[PDB]
């Protein structure tokens, strides 16, 4: 049975094309649009609403990425509204990632244009089901009350907790977009920046997997997490204030350090919130039982949120009771229960986010992608032999598990590692940094196995070990990273530390070259066996 | 089409060398030979620990490494002063992991299956399942029983998994020069 | 009336001495002191092994002996060559026995209780329950986590059980002669 | 509601007393009797049936023990039948065990006489429910067919397997009694001996717990297992042919040795069955899953039974299928499924059996008991220092668990140990017998942990270590045993070996003296703490 996604009907008057692939659409009444692919929204007259974001003719062009792996945002136009749809320039690069992974081929529309308007279900690609973005009426009422309280009280803190697959991420995106874009009274009011504390390592937003981050947004989040996996450090639409490497998909390897990371990130938010009023939206892990419940209680005790929002009505009574106790122990903190509106597994989305992060170019749209396979790129050579001033990295620190020194080279090879800047010398205390150096790797023994201190270290970015050369003439690491060369050359060698953790093995990078060669057509690769 | 399975070992030669280190008698006395065998077994168990850290290691390899590590800790020094809870606990955790992984792999959620029924379906002796249950819900099994069951379990894993693998016989950071660069697979220098 | 509880130890002095050997710091540096502490801990774990052989030993005493034996095997020699599956397996079996015994003791068959609900009812941290589940159905937990959890578990058992025990400060075969015989309790010469 | 157990009604004619407590009862019609306590049956006229045993005036007096812990045997008299009921002389000693254990006081009738006829439920003791002995009609039909086949084919082997609490023991007792006492044709036919292969260590009959045995019966088994726990070795009614110490309640410590024991015992049965035709009844453990199913299959393969009888209709299909496969693999062995007609836990009955064994006098009635507490008896002194010819025992062998040598004295003290006769020198090969000897105990190291070989060793009996004296002047063991002094003095010191296993701790013996003192009235005892 055909389901009508878009209520718009085109004719010669309302719907017109323009050179460069752009489109001009004039709706005299309220209309809805479900558009699949990458596009840009710029309204000539009237007000539109997309994913909770309100756009007016004063506002600039907003770039939307809508793969059908996630729910497609619905663009609603009020009466007497003239809008312009623009093709996305950078999107082609992302589509060229289809050459490296079959998963990136299924994401977008099959039409030659970047974006396709989905009038009926027949316009969908074959063997794919399109789901529209939806919000509960209770969600809209709660966000309206939150906006009124935010106008009453400057810089609120909104804690969003819930079970996994409860739709907390969708509610977080609409909450952020409505806090940013919605203006009451004067239409000349500018958009407010919104600061997002992303504390979910397993399913992160604005950060690569295994990373907790603090992000400042002046532009609405209209893209999936893998469409903006890495944001450059700080006038841009989305800038990253600070990151820390959990180096795992779950905090269960070290909960307390996790809490410490949150504290440090919260401190930086305070160093903004003193100067200007900025709402903070906190994204939490989907762990509601066992150690995760204690983690949520500790996060409530640390952050002191203005409100706590549990995203499931039908959640376990022990979890709701523990969260209510954690709220009531501090002060009168309003705890509100919300409905949970709930293909692609989280592990696959995590791998897509990591691949999209590593394919970011070092250099409307924010992010740009490089279609070149990781096997074809010229790698960074990090010198391992010499004085700590001479070496590219100070040493290698293993998180939670101490390999034998002969096994470190095999363990880190072809694996994602974190790059950590040592801001203060107090982080290295208690650890034996190797001195002036087949030569061995510079390995810092970590007998406790705990991560480095968040308040003295920061995360520059993630690297992928292209190879390890332990020859006596030139001991070095070949590695690939999306960090720009200016940032890498700004740091000194004694400030940088490579960190091994429990990131997932980048198995996409191993067969990326094989997929590229197979697509271009129409020896033994390490860690890959082939069926025939 | 072509399907890819990703392995913690770089190539099949690494896996076959680790198999030879676990099983010197099948693949192929003096005190030097015994010390060499013990050292190679320790090297292999360390490699399987690295493989489990990387991810994608099969359950049979982990079970073999756990049983060989328990046997090595038994042979190196028995905890006669401590009553052997170190050695017996190593054996009991190896058996718990081995039986739990095998049963969880071969169980079906659709049909209600007893653990002994799954053990019969796999071909696993029920002695290992009873040993797992005794180590979990009762006191630890005795050291002699754990030794005999560990040797039988290692032989069972050899006949189940290991035999079928094959026949038995700013100068710190420099961008690399684009003229000299030849594309290679990930992990090759 | 008078009710009798039968204990593996002969008297309460034996139990308090074993408590002092498990916990020298609570009941009461130099290398001789460290060696003495290790030897007394080994003696105590051997005594608890004998007690478990006799029968009637409480679960907390067995759990303490298992954790102390795992700690002793860690401290004596780490299996760095073997990757630590001996030591980590000893820790994992100690935790499996400890958590399984506590939960099986305090569970109720009448009411459906999750394992975390029983852990909350006892007061046990859920870290031990997650550690047991990871050691059973997943790979073994890392050595640092097992060390920290073992020390915390030993402190928890001290506060749960050990503190409440007391204040802390044809000539081969000859029938025996009937004239000199005086009746004694069983086990007294 | 009153339930009428006995249909007999007394008057001056049928019911007569006689001095010494004896009773003469003449029933002109078929009557049933439920008698509680210890009595003796001797019929003057007619045929009676008790627990499947048929008694005729030719037969002698048969002694019955009926505690209400087990089902009371029902004595059925045919038409025109005159019987005599006799008090039991030895029973007083058993009743005096009530002075040492409150469990032994609950067993018998409260009337001053040894036996009381239970006409109605009001004649029962207070707070006690009396259950009659019952047999399924299918059981009687199967036993009748078995008797016909036994008359056709000499010396059948009847394997009785089933789940625990399936009533296999009751069926075994009635099967043995009907094979023994039932005579067809000529009434002058004598009773046949029946050999019972008891392979159940957890719930044994004719043997103490932890012991497998081969027993020859010329007199019907009308008593519970704790009323005949130990039988003297070989014209008596019940004699023990051979014994072996499993030293555990289950074979799970060593299954194969268990099978070996059965083989040896079966061999001795063959050394009888060649001379005369004797039926063998095999009692098996109630272990039907896991290793126990393989044990049952191995026992079927070893014994080659004439028929196999599974005692449960509603048994697991995998167990019945495995038993059918084990039967059909050897030959055409008839496998018959039977109904399972199913307070006092098995552990308590095991403790009562062990206490009754250790309270047996060295000298319908067969057994006689000693009311004296075990703490008051003069113990045997076993010399531990000297040559192997000089020592009382050759050494101490631990089964399945090797203690440290300092811990052996604490482990064996106040515990039940087996006394094993080394018939052949091949049993000690591979084991280091200690040489000419605080002196240490003579301890034989057993690195394998396996039990001694059944075909070269035998079990004289069980001992209880009264105490261990490790003084330098006289190292010795004080121990208590029901074995007669002539048997103990017949063996040389180098033939005897003490065996430590997994018998239950004799906690009855520790507080036996306290119970005796408390009953007579109306220091610290090792391993006992007292509530007040």
Q: How many CB atoms lie within 10 A of CB B44?
A: 24
C-beta atoms of A381 and B8 within 8 A? no
Check: CB of residue A201 under 8 Å from CB of residue A214.
no
User: Across the B/C interface, how many CB contacts are shorter than 8 Å?
Assistant: 133
Check: CB of residue D383 under 8 Å from CB of residue D437.
no
Six-digit token string for A162: 């819930």
Start-end of H helices in D32-105: 91-96
**Interface membership of B81 toward D (CB under 8 Å):** yes
In degrees and rounded to multiples of 5, residue D485 shows phi and psi of -60, -30
Taken in order A324, A326, A329, A332, the sign of the CA dihedral is negative
Q: Scanning every residue of chain C, which has its alpha carbon at the shortest distance from the alpha carbon of B57? A: C139
- Give the single-character DSSP code of A499: E
Q: Between the CA of residue D456 and those of A316, D199, D429, D430, what are the distances in Å?
A: 65, 19, 11, 14
Please give the Cα distance from D180 to D513 (Å, whole number): 42
Six-digit token string for C4: 């009798």
Query: What is the number of alpha carbons within 13 Å of residue A154 lying toward its C-beta?
Result: 9
* Chain A neighbors of B180, CB-CB under 8 A: none
Please give the Cα distance from D238 to D191 (Å, whole number): 13
C-beta atoms of A383 and B12 within 8 A? no
C-beta atoms of B126 and D291 within 8 A? yes
Interface probe for C, chosen from B83, B102, B143 (most Cβ of C below 10 Å), is B83
What resolution in angstroms, rounded to 1 decimal? 3.0
Reference A512, options A354, A346, A349, A368; nearest CA is A354
- Please name the member of D289, D290, D401 whose beta carbon is closest to the beta carbon of B142: D401
Helix (H) or strand (E) holding A490: helix A485-490
Q: Scanning every residue of chain C, which has its alpha carbon at the shortest distance from the alpha carbon of B64? A: C85
List the subunits that have 3+ CB pairs under 8 angstroms with C. A, B, D
In degrees and rounded to multiples of 5, residue D87 shows phi and psi of -70, 150
Check: CB of residue C115 under 8 Å from CB of residue C137.
no
Characterise D304 by phi-psi region: left (phi > 0), alpha (psi -120 to 50), beta (else): left
Quick check: helix, strand or coil at residue A429? coil
Quick check: helix, strand or coil at residue D412? helix
Burial of A42 (0-12, 13-18, 19+ CB in 10 A): middle
Burial of B21 (0-12, 13-18, 19+ CB in 10 A): buried
Q: What is the DSSP string of D443-477?
A: EE--SS-PPPPTTTEEEEEEEEEEEEE--SS--EE
Characterise D258 by phi-psi region: left (phi > 0), alpha (psi -120 to 50), beta (else): alpha
Pairing, β A443-444 against β A396-398: parallel
Which positions ≥6 away from B172 have C-beta within 8 Å?
A: A382, A383, A390, A391, A392, A393, A492, A493
- Residue A39 β-bridge partners: A64, A87
Please give the Cα distance from B38 to B43 (Å, whole number): 9
C-beta atoms of A252 and C130 within 8 A? yes
- Please name the member of B6, B9, B185 whose beta carbon is closest to the beta carbon of A507: B6
Q: What is the DSSP string of A229-297?
A: ----B---SEEEEEEEE--SSSGGG-HHHHHHHHHHHHHHHHHHHTTS---EEEE--S--STHHHHHHH
Q: Between the CA of residue A349 and those of A72, A352, A356, what are the distances in Å?
A: 16, 5, 10
Minimal Cα–Cα distance from A442 to chain B, Å?
14
Check: CB of residue A253 under 8 Å from CB of residue A208.
no
Quick check: helix, strand or coil at residue A47? coil
Mark which residues 110-129 of C lie under 8 Å from A by CB: 116-117, 120, 126-127, 129
Please give the Cα distance from A382 to A472 (Å, whole number): 15
Reference A279, options A201, A172, A204; nearest CA is A172
In chain A the first and final C-alpha atoms are separated, in Å, by: 40
* Chain C neighbors of A296, CB-CB under 8 A: none
Taken in order C20, C26, C32, C34, the sign of the CA dihedral is positive
Our CA angle for A453, A459, A465, nearest 5°, is 115
Reference D248, options D396, D350, D395; nearest CA is D350
Cα of C110 vs its chain's centroid, Å: 30
Overall size of chain C counted in residues: 189
Check: CB of residue A294 under 8 Å from CB of residue A150.
no
Six-digit token string for A479: 């590695």
For D475-532, the three-class secondary structure string (H helix, E strand, C coil) is CEEEEECCCCHHHHHHCCHHHEEEEECCCCCCHHHHHHHHHHHHHHHCCCCCCEEECC
* Chain B neighbors of C115, CB-CB under 8 A: none
Query: What is the number of alpha carbons within 13 Å of residue C176 lying toward its C-beta?
Result: 20
For chain C, the three-class secondary structure string (H helix, E strand, C coil) is CCCEEECCCCCHHHHHHHHHHHCHHHHCCCHHHHHHHHHHHHHHHHHHHHHHHHCCCCHHHHHHHHHHHHHHHHHHCCCCCCCCHHHHHHHHHHHHHHHHHHHHHHCCCCCCCCHHHHHHHHCCCHHHHHHHHHHHHCCCCCHHHHHHHHHHHHHHHHHHCHHHHCCCCCCCEEECCCCCCCCCCCCCC
Classify domain D15-123 at the CATH superfamily level.
Clp1, DNA binding domain (2.60.120.1030)
Exposure letters D122-145 (e unless 16+ CB within 10 A, then b): ebbbeeeebeebebeeebeebbee
Q: Between the CA of residue C142 and those of A61, B71, D143, what are the distances in Å?
A: 50, 20, 63
Helix (H) or strand (E) holding D16: strand D15-18
Strand order in the sheet with A280-283: A238-245, A211-217, A194-198, A280-283, A157-161, A307-310, A335-337
Minimal Cα–Cα distance from C78 to chain A, Å?
12
Residue with tokens 């749809």: A85
Question: By what technique were these coordinates determined?
Answer: cryo-EM
Mark which residues 4-33 of C lie under 8 Å from B by CB: none
- Give the single-character DSSP code of A127: T
Six-digit token string for A513: 């070259």
Our CA angle for A154, A155, A159, nearest 5°, is 135
Which residues sit directly before a break in chain C (C to N > 2.5 Å)?
28, 169
Q: Scanning every residue of chain A, which has its alpha carbon at the shortest distance from the alpha carbon of B183? A: A376
From the CB coordinates, do chains A and B have 3 or more pairs under 8 Å? yes
**Interface membership of B142 toward D (CB under 8 Å):** yes
Angle of helix B31-54 versus helix B12-22 axis, rounded to 10: 140
Which positions ≥6 away from B30 have C-beta within 8 Å?
A: none
List the subunits that have 3+ CB pairs under 8 angstroms with B. A, C, D
Reference C121, options C131, C111, C133, C136; nearest CA is C111
Please give the Cα distance from B40 to B30 (Å, whole number): 15
**Interface membership of B7 toward A (CB under 8 Å):** yes
Please give the Cα distance from B12 to A528 (Å, whole number): 10
> What is the longest distance spanned by two Cα atoms in chain D?
76
- Give the single-character DSSP code of A91: H
From the CB coordinates, do chains C and A have 3 or more pairs under 8 Å? yes
Please give the Cα distance from C150 to C69 (Å, whole number): 11
Please give the Cα distance from A462 to A498 (Å, whole number): 9
- Give the single-character DSSP code of D293: H
Please give the Cα distance from D19 to B4 (Å, whole number): 98
Helix (H) or strand (E) holding B144: helix B143-160
Mark which residues 31-60 of C lie under 8 Å from A by CB: none
In degrees and rounded to multiples of 5, residue B58 shows phi and psi of -70, 160
Which positions ≥6 away from A356 have C-beta within 8 Å?
A: A94, A97, A226, A227, A229, A369
Q: How big, in percent rounded to 5, are the helix, strand and coil portions of chain A?
A: 25, 25, 50
Query: What is the number of alpha carbons within 13 Å of residue C98 lying toward its C-beta?
Result: 35
Q: Scanning every residue of chain B, which has its alpha carbon at the shortest distance from the alpha carbon of A478? A: B189
CATH architecture of D137-337: 3-Layer(aba) Sandwich (3.40)
Residue with tokens 């056709």: D152
Exposure letters C19-33 (e unless 16+ CB within 10 A, then b): bbbbbeeeeeeeeee
Helix (H) or strand (E) holding D144: helix D137-152
Please give the Cα distance from D447 to D296 (Å, whole number): 28
Six-digit token string for A143: 């966000």
In degrees and rounded to multiples of 5, residue A86 shows phi and psi of -115, 140
Q: Between the CA of residue A273 and those of A92, A205, A280, A304, C63, what are the distances in Å?
A: 38, 22, 9, 14, 51
Cα of A408 vs its chain's centroid, Å: 29
Residue with tokens 């676990």: B22
- Please name the member of C62, C72, C85 whose beta carbon is closest to the beta carbon of B69: C85
For A129-174, the three-class secondary structure string (H helix, E strand, C coil) is CCCECCCCHHHHHHHHHHHHHHHHCCCCEEEEECCCCCCHHHHHHH
In degrees and rounded to multiples of 5, residue D94 shows phi and psi of -60, -40
C-beta atoms of C137 and B104 within 8 A? yes
Angle of helix D346-358 versus helix D507-521 axis, rounded to 10: 70
Q: How many CB atoms lie within 10 A of CB A397?
A: 24
Q: What is the DSSP string of A193-230?
A: PEEEEE--SSS-SSS-TTEEEEEEESS---S-TTTS--
Please give the Cα distance from A38 to D49 (Å, whole number): 96
Q: How big, in percent rounded to 5, are the helix, strand and coil portions of chain B?
A: 65, 5, 35
Pairing, β D238-245 against β D211-217: antiparallel
Please give the Cα distance from A346 to D125 (Å, whole number): 70
Check: CB of residue A16 under 8 Å from CB of residue A5.
no
With the CA atoms of D54, D55, D58 and D61 taken in that order, what torsion angle do they form, in degrees rounded to the nearest 10? Answer: 140
- Residue D283 β-bridge partners: D160, D198
Minimal Cα–Cα distance from C181 to chain B, Å?
37
Q: Scanning every residue of chain C, which has its alpha carbon at the shortest distance from the alpha carbon of D381? A: C174
Please give the Cα distance from D178 to D148 (Å, whole number): 11
Burial of A196 (0-12, 13-18, 19+ CB in 10 A): buried
C-beta atoms of C116 and A318 within 8 A? yes
Quick check: helix, strand or coil at residue D82? strand
- Give the single-character DSSP code of B170: -
Q: Scanning every residue of chain D, which has its alpha carbon at the shortest distance from the alpha carbon of B120? A: D290
Six-digit token string for D347: 């552990």
Residue with tokens 């209309």: A31
**Interface membership of B6 toward A (CB under 8 Å):** yes
Domain ranges of chain D: 15-123, 137-337, 367-510
- Give the single-character DSSP code of D257: H
Six-digit token string for D68: 């209400």
Minimal Cα–Cα distance from B89 to chain D, Å?
15
Q: How many CB atoms lie within 10 A of CB D438?
A: 10
Angle of helix C85-106 versus helix B85-106 axis, rounded to 10: 80
* Chain C neighbors of D510, CB-CB under 8 A: 4, 6, 185-187
Check: CB of residue C90 under 8 Å from CB of residue B89.
yes
Please give the Cα distance from A436 to A433 (Å, whole number): 10
- Residue D195 β-bridge partners: D216, D280
Six-digit token string for A128: 């794919």
Count of H helices and E strands in chain A? 10, 24
Taken in order D247, D250, D255, D260, the sign of the CA dihedral is positive
Check: CB of residue A158 under 8 Å from CB of residue A175.
yes
* Chain B neighbors of C77, CB-CB under 8 A: 77
Six-digit token string for D2: 């009153």
Q: What is the DSSP string of B53-97?
A: HHS---HHHHHHHHHHHHHHHHHH---TTTTTHHHHHHHHHHHHH
Six-digit token string for D515: 């119970």
C-beta atoms of D467 and C2 within 8 A? no
Six-digit token string for D169: 């023991």
Q: Scanning every residue of chain B, which has its alpha carbon at the shortest distance from the alpha carbon of D254? A: B145
Q: How many CB atoms lie within 10 A of CB D307?
A: 18
Quick check: helix, strand or coil at residue A25? strand
Our CA angle for D452, D457, D461, nearest 5°, is 100
Please give the Cα distance from A503 to A209 (Å, whole number): 8
Overall size of chain D counted in residues: 532
Please give the Cα distance from B69 to B59 (Å, whole number): 15
Long-range contacts of D122-131 (CB under 8 A, 24+ apart): D122/D2, D124/D36, D124/D68, D125/D68, D128/D68, D130/D5, D130/D34, D130/D36, D130/D68, D130/D72, D131/D71, D131/D72
């Amino acid at each position: 049975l055909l389901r009508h996604h878009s209520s718009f009907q085109p004719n010669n008057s309302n719907f017109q094309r323009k050179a460069g692939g752009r489109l001009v659409l004039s709706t005299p009444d309220v209309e809805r649009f479900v558009i699949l692919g990458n596009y840009g929204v710029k309204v000539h007259q009237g007000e539109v609403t997309i994913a909770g974001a309100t756009l007016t003719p004063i506002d600039d062009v907003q770039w939307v990425h809508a793969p059908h792996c996630h729910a497609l945002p619905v663009l609603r136009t009020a009466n007497d509204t003239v809008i312009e749809l623009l093709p996305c320039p950078t999107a082609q690069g992302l589509r060229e990632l289809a050459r490296l992974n079959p998963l990136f081929g299924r994401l977008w529309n099959e039409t030659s244009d970047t974006f396709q308007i989905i009038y009926t279900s027949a316009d969908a690609p074959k063997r794919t089901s399109l789901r529209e973005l939806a919000s509960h009426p209770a969600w809209n009422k709660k966000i309206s009350e939150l906006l009124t309280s935010t106008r009453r009280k400057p810089s609120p803190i909104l804690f969003i907790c819930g079970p996994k697959s409860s739709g907390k991420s969708t509610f977080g995106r609409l909450l952020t977009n409505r806090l940013m874009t919605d203006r009451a009274g004067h239409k000349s009011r500018s958009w407010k920046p919104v600061m997002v504390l992303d504390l979910d390592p397993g399913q992160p937003e604005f950060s690569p997997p295994g990373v907790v981050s603090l992000t400042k947004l002046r532009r609405p989040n209209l893209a999936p997490p893998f469409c903006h996996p890495g944001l450059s450090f700080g006038n841009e639409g989305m800038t990253t204030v600070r990151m820390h490497a959990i180096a795992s998909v779950t905090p269960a390897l070290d909960p307390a350090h996790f809490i410490a990371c949150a504290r440090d990130l919260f401190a930086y938010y305070r160093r903004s919130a003193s100067q200007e009023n900025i709402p903070l939206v906190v994204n939490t892990p989907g762990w509601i039982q066992g150690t995760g419940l204690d983690l949520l209680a500790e996060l409530i005790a640390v952050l002191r949120p203005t409100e706590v929002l549990y995203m499931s009505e039908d959640g376990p009574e022990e979890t709701v009771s523990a969260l209510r106790e954690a709220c009531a122990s501090s002060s009168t903190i309003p705890f509100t229960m919300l409905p949970s509106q709930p293909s692609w597994t989280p592990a696959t989305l995590r791998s897509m986010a990591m691949q999209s992060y590593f394919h970011l170019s070092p250099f409307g749209p924010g992010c740009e992608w490089n279609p070149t396979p990781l096997t074809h790129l010229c790698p960074w050579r990090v010198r391992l032999a010499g004085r700590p001033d001479e070496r590219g990295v100070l040493g290698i620190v293993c998180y939670d598990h101490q390999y034998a020194p002969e096994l470190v080279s095999d363990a880190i090879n072809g694996m994602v590692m974190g790059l950590v800047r040592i801001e203060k010398k107090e982080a290295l205390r208690g650890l034996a940094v190797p001195g002036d150096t087949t030569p061995l790797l510079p390995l810092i023994p970590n007998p406790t196995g705990s991560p480095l201190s968040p308040q003295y270290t920061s995360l520059v970015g993630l690297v992928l070990i292209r190879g390890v050369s332990l020859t006596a003439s030139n001991p070095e690491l070949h590695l690939l990273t999306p960090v720009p060369p200016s940032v890498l050359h700004s740091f000194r060698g004694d400030e940088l530390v490579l960190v091994a953790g429990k990131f997932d093995a980048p198995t996409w990078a191993y067969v990326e070259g094989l997929y590229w060669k197979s697509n271009s057509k129409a020896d033994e690769v390490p860690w890959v066996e082939m069926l025939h | 089409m072509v399907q890819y399975i990703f392995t913690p070992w770089r190539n099949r030669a690494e896996l076959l060398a680790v198999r030879a280190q676990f099983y010197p008698e099948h693949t192929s006395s003096t005190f030097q030979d015994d010390e060499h065998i013990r050292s190679e077994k320790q090297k292999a168990v360390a490699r399987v620990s690295m493989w489990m850290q990387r991810g994608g290691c099969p359950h049979m390899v982990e079970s073999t490494a756990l049983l060989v590590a328990a046997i090595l800790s038994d042979e190196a020094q028995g905890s006669g002063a401590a009553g052997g809870y170190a050695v017996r606990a190593a054996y009991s955790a190896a058996f718990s992991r081995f039986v739990t992984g095998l049963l969880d792999s071969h169980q079906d959620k659709q049909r209600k299956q007893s653990m002994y029924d799954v053990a019969k379906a796999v071909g696993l002796p029920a002695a290992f399942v009873e040993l797992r249950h005794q180590a979990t819900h009762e006191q630890l099994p005795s050291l002699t029983r754990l030794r005999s069951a560990a040797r039988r379990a290692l032989e069972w894993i050899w006949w189940y998994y290991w035999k079928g693998l094959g026949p038995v016989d700013q100068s710190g950071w420099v961008l690399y020069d684009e003229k000299e660069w030849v594309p290679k697979p990930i992990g090759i220098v």
